[PDB]
Design a protein around this ligand. Structure first.
Ligand SMILES: CC(=O)N[C@H]1[C@H]([C@H](O)[C@H](O)CO)O[C@@](O[C@@H]2[C@@H](O)[C@H](O)O[C@H](CO)[C@@H]2O)(C(=O)O)C[C@@H]1O
Ligand SMILES: CC(=O)N[C@H]1[C@H]([C@H](O)[C@H](O)CO)O[C@@](O[C@@H]2[C@@H](O)[C@H](O)O[C@H](CO)[C@@H]2O)(C(=O)O)C[C@@H]1O
Ligand SMILES: CC(=O)N[C@H]1[C@H]([C@H](O)[C@H](O)CO)O[C@@](O[C@@H]2[C@@H](O)[C@H](O)O[C@H](CO)[C@@H]2O)(C(=O)O)C[C@@H]1O
Ligand SMILES: *[C@@H]1O[C@H](CO)[C@@H](O)[C@H](O)[C@H]1NC(C)=O
Ligand SMILES: *[C@@H]1O[C@H](CO)[C@@H](O)[C@H](O)[C@H]1NC(C)=O
Ligand SMILES: *[C@@H]1O[C@H](CO)[C@@H](O)[C@H](O)[C@H]1NC(C)=O
Lengths: 321, 164, 164, 164, 321, 321
């Protein structure tokens, strides 16, 4: 005689998944949709290679820390890597105005082209080669930032400067300058003769006037003196005008912005891996087709979607026993 | 078994069946063996494939997290920043986990459904000409040859037959 | 058919039925025709109406988006602003789409359920006095007049009757 | 009744049953009474307990709201702050309410399922030796003593018996 | 003999909907819950009509751009429309302090009542009718903002001003003033005699002191000079005190705020439609009972809830074939 | 003959719950997961007791409002309670720089230890006991803030002050100071002789120079004069340097921060209950095992998760009739 039966698949897979009502339920086929693996390396993002400041901050890079010459001229970059606590920041103590806002601009640029907008030679009536500290040493000898220039008196005289400058390029200039805040009145005359000074700076948009604050402060890097830096963006066809009678750390090199685009500033301790990816996190890169990952929320490139879980498995088959 | 078929009235699964999700085992005079229902198995493939790609599509613009840095006197907006980025990352992490748990259950019950509906497709043919055993099998009041079965699987089955 | 009724064992739907979602077609000696079950059809109306207004009510305070403008040195909080407003608009857009897909399925299966439960209401009355055809119909071992049926639909059906 | 068992074909519930969710009432010669199925009732306990603790676990890191104060010229970020904290509190409030409504339904249907699957466990034993009444009961074509039933409940039931 | 059958509805509707497991599934009845249609017009919101600056910004409106007289006196409004890039902003180049914060206040006001708080006549010892530029032309002739007044020297003399002003109304005053930043020392004496000046301003809450920044700047609208505007809110029963010896663009008209309430600033290129709605977006208005819409996130009035989808259909009926 | 039946539970519970498709559906067993009950009291959080300023703000506390002596010395606290509108704020009118940021720091501290860093005695060449107003009355007599000290001229002379101060503790100091803004030139000489003054202040990080703004202002608390307060955080081993020739409200007591940790500033009208909890909201405390509550979003301690609903009931049993 004959019977006939109806039944389903079972097999040799050990792979549990979860439902709303029961956990660790073994099934036949199961798909994993969470990627949990990186390569622990900092890669190029599609062939264009990152800017990895090493022990430099953005400030030391942009201003020209003489410990930062690796980055005197930096090619087009895909994203930037800064350490948590870069050792080479402001070697002469002070501050950098609107610093996080400028770091925010940087997350939207892929290429600067440094250009010299006022030659160190062009300074006829002031000294422009004696503006150097021990707090900014270059190879043991007293140096200073390369991109700005610390002008001082010549022949016991700081005649008032009027330097204008017209951006005739097709690109915005990032332009940096600063003021020097002396430690005392004696220092102020030793350096600039005139006891009472200022720096005015104007564009179409910027209208500032800076006076230095002479004052006793704690020592940092050996000094009680401070340097305070300011920056602006020069629009194509606009001029920047500087007039000052002392304490003026004049620009010398500025940056053309020749590639805005999508970038990021990554805080990471890692260093250049020598690879290529389409998706980068600060603890390594990801090569995965998975729609999700749980590595790290800050990410750049064509990326799986970050998620906090350590386990996402989707059931395809049926119950197995 | 929400539908009571899988691990319900049928006991285990058929290790031997290597051709589809569901099907048959027959115990007749020309041979014995296994077949799988294209109709239902294929319909289920289409099912979960569609489920997967709709889950993936439902979360393909989600929430990107850009880096903003704050200084020392900006601890309030820095916190605001942090707790908003965190907060989103948390609701999206919940959504993924929740959606997965639900769709897993509704999927297991889906396969179960497909079984009980196959069992009903056959049962609604062999009305008199077989008896329901109780473990998903039908004993025949006649003789059923390989070719009788091909009529069964494709569900065109000839009822014009006696009984006793 | 998750419950296997709709497009499962019943083939198509009854174009002719213009009175409710589900019901009957009878093929007797005083006439032929269609009727719809108030009990079940009305219960389903109450069903989806409640579904709709609970979906609408569940999302009636959601997220409004006020306009804030930022200047040129406020690109960080301007971005923060943008990505938070965007981000919310995205999770609420997901929620609506997701909730809809789910409730659509659970609703189709709801109607299917209602059918199979109607078919069971009748079947659990005509036990001996009819045979299950296989396509959702019962052939009568007696004669069933218009008035016999009215007893059926309203489910008070007189079983005190022979069989053969 | 989505599965049509609870409040479907069985009418009410058994006030008398104080031992589990589901079970039996028997009407035999040595006694009458109620018993509850450990197998199914216990499986359901495990069910909803798991449901509860997964709902609680799914929302155990959620969104905390820290207090930030803003001054008089910070009405924009103060609003931003407010509407982000509000906004989160709203999507999390939705999620809780939504998740609850869904799991409530899927739970009621779960219990219903368990009933219809119990009714099927018995029915798939007493095939010939009883008749389906229609309200969830089986009338016996034999005599069934207390000990016959213990064989039933634990589902090992001896079919080797005649019929008429 | 007799049979009896059980079955469901099918009909002649072509309307697919989507589930989690299958797409484009045809059904009998289906409800649409997404509204995708506007009227492309800017309407009144329940009978109270919008303020549509045309080519004016808020700054030109509030300060009195002489190209902005359409809005010399503006009735109660329901919401405001500004273009992306209004042509009539600050005609004399400069800036407007805390501008986005004041735009934020405006989103919470429906009615100003301009009132004159210091008559142009009241200025006995300065000239108050010669303070006009070509950068602010009114009908070809050199004009200037109407709501403020550019005082200058008289009889080669700018005696120091002390003007106090007490808000005796039941409403907050919005009060605007400014400082003029000259191009050079020559200009400063030509205009105000005294080489060294200031403007102090105090209320219960505000305690400022402004000094003008003389400086060379690029030309905007013909000028290297700048005008910088400041604003405050005067509390009912408080006074504002002004003392200055030059460079002081004094107020003349202020605004009483006589209806705070719910409003918005809409950026839109559109113009007055001549209709009425209960819900407005910047690309047109909505008349719909639908609970959702996908038109535009910024919205004012009794509004469907914005959603990014282009399709939301809810199943009512059952499967059809 | 025998039958046998199959059936489910019904009982005497009246407890409805809700599904997606039907409301108010009665069931057998139901669990409540929303907590809706507080004790209307302000409690200790696990045995460590709150700081409840009563009619004091943080500013009056920290600066030493002479109406605020309850809080001269405040023990370790678990969280702080401020009223919506504290009556004892700045008794001499003025402002407190970066005030919300300092309130934000406070939400991260549980204990200050007030220490005297410059004795009122230490002032040899200025008067330090006549710096008192009627706007800061202590028991009817003219007083002033306790933590700062309002120095004035002595023997018709305010010689320029140079006070340095080195934080040699293991903890950060919160250090407060201020400047006095006079009402007129007459007042300025009456108080400090020298017509033209300043206060410079430097640390490793802070480099400011303050000049007072002499100006006519409306009266607040009887005065047109203003006091403006500034604060800093001194790092362990850093110094703060003060140099001034007038208008200098010098510090006298500072705060060591000896317990950073998790705290909050609660706005509440309530007062000390005398109880203990593990979870506190500003309208009362919660003792509940529930996973959710709908009391108030701002919360501190081991807390149920806030939710806006007034009803969350989870079905355990089955349908009942
Ligand atoms: C531009 C210049 O004068 N350079 C000086 C420098 C400056 O005069 C000073 O930093 C004021 O800005 O002073 C230098 O020398 C000394 C350092 O060798 C040492 O670290 O600290 C000393 C006392 O504080 C003193 O300043 C310097 O910083 O390099 C010498 C340099 O030529
Ligand atoms: C109030 C006054 O003096 N008005 C002058 C105006 C001002 O002196 C000047 O803008 C300083 O604020 O100068 C005016 O005239 C010229 C313009 O006709 C032209 O656009 O540019 C010229 C050189 O830069 C020059 O300023 C003006 O701006 O209207 C004449 C007006 O009476
Ligand atoms: C430190 C000192 O001089 N204290 C004075 C005080 C100040 O001179 C003044 O507040 C300038 O900062 O002036 C005092 O007296 C008067 C008050 O009694 C009254 O409320 O208002 C008066 C006129 O405006 C006047 O100032 C004071 O405020 O206590 C007397 C005190 O010794
Ligand atoms: C800079 O140079 C361009 C081109 O030579 C000129 O037209 C323009 O007016 C100048 N820009 C300024 C602001 O001086
Ligand atoms: C303004 O006038 C009112 C009413 O005349 C007066 O009481 C009040 O003190 C004045 N306000 C100021 C700040 O001068
Ligand atoms: C403060 O004192 C310490 C210990 O005596 C000393 O080493 C340090 O340099 C001083 N700090 C400053 C900034 O003066």
């Amino acid at each position: 005689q004959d019977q006939i039966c109806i039944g389903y698949h079972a097999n040799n897979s050990t792979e549990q998944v979860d439902t709303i009502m029961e956990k660790n339920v073994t099934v036949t086929h199961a798909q994993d949709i969470l990627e949990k693996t990186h390569n622990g390396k900092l890669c190029d993002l599609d062939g264009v290679k990152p800017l990895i400041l090493r022990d430099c901050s953005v400030a030391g890079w942009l201003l020209g820390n003489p410990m930062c010459d690796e980055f005197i001229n930096v090619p087009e970059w895909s994203y930037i890597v800064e350490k948590a606590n870069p050792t080479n920041d402001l070697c002469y103590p002070g501050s950098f105005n609107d610093y996080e806002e400028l770091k925010y601009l940087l997350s939207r640029i892929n290429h600067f082209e440094k250009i010299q907008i006022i030659p160190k030679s062009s300074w006829s009536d002031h000294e422009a080669s004696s503006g150097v500290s021990s707090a900014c040493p270059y190879l043991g000898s007293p140096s200073f930032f390369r991109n700005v220039v610390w002008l001082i008196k010549k022949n016991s005289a700081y005649p008032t400067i009027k330097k204008s400058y017209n951006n005739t390029n097709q690109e915005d200039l990032l332009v940096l300058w600063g003021i020097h805040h002396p430690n005392d009145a004696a220092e102020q005359t030793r350096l600039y003769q005139n006891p009472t000074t200022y720096i005015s700076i104007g564009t179409s948009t910027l209208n500032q006037r800076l006076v230095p604050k002479i004052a006793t402060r704690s020592k940092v890097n050996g000094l009680s003196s401070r340097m305070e830096f300011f920056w602006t963006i020069l629009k194509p066809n606009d001029a920047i005008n500087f007039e000052s009678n002392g304490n003026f750390i004049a620009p010398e090199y500025a940056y053309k912005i020749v590639k805005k685009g999508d970038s990021a500033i990554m805080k990471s301790e890692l260093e250049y891996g020598n690879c290529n990816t389409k998706c980068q996190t600060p603890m390594g890169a990801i090569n995965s087709s998975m729609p999700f990952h749980n590595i790290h929320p800050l990410t750049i490139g064509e990326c799986p979607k970050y998620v906090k879980s350590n386990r996402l498995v989707l059931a395809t088959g049926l119950r197995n026993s | 078994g929400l539908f009571g078929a899988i691990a319900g009235f049928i006991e285990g699964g058929w290790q031997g069946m290597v051709d589809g999700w569901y099907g048959y085992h027959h115990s007749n005079e020309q041979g014995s063996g296994y077949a799988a229902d294209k109709e239902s198995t294929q319909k289920a493939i289409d099912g979960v494939t569609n489920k997967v790609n709709s889950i993936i599509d439902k979360m393909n613009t989600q929430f990107e997290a850009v880096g903003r840095e704050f200084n020392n006197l900006e601890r309030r907006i820095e916190n605001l920043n942090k707790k908003m980025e965190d907060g989103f990352l948390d609701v999206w992490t919940y959504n993924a986990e929740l959606l997965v748990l639900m769709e897993n259950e509704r999927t297991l019950d889906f396969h179960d459904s497909n079984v009980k509906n196959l069992y009903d497709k056959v049962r609604l043919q062999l009305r008199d000409n077989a008896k329901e055993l109780g473990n998903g099998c039908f004993e025949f009041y006649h003789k059923c040859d390989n070719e009788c079965m091909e009529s069964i699987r494709n569900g065109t089955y000839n009822y014009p037959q006696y009984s006793e």
